[PDB]
UniProtKB/TrEMBL annotation:
<protein>
    <recommendedName>
        <fullName>DUF952 domain-containing protein</fullName>
    </recommendedName>
</protein>
<dbReference type="InterPro" id="IPR009297">
    <property type="entry name" value="DUF952"/>
</dbReference>
<dbReference type="Pfam" id="PF06108">
    <property type="entry name" value="DUF952"/>
</dbReference>
Length: 114
């Protein structure tokens, strides 16, 4: 099961300079890194990242993550993957630079189809 994280290019480069991503401002505030399962990802992008250019999508295999990866019932009653530890750069299976629609919404369609 692949889970996803959307973040700014600046934050992703900063993470690679550290060897791991500790979280966005919101993640840090909440105490965990907000990730989305494939079927929840596009809505997450439409809700929190509108109009943001240079975003990057990180795809992560959930199975080997361990105890710090907790699935918690959240938006619409769906269980969202929450990581209670930094995301290692090595745990990213693949990344991709995102483009926006005419409404400023990042397009995840093609990447989720992989």
């Amino acid at each position: 099961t692949l889970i996803y994280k959307i973040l700014s290019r600046a934050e992703w480069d900063a993470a690679k300079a550290q060897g791991r991503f500790e979280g966005s401002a919101m993640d840090l505030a909440d105490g965990f890194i907000h990730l989305s399962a494939g079927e929840q990802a596009q809505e997450t992008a439409a809700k929190w990242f509108r109009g943001q250019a240079n975003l990057v999508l990180l795809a992560v295999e959930a199975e080997p993550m361990g105890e710090d990866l907790k699935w918690e019932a959240s938006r619409g009653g769906a269980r969202f993957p929450h990581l209670y530890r930094p995301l290692l750069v090595s745990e990213v299976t693949r990344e991709a630079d995102l483009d926006l629609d005419a409404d400023g919404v990042p397009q995840l369609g093609d990447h989720l189809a992989l």
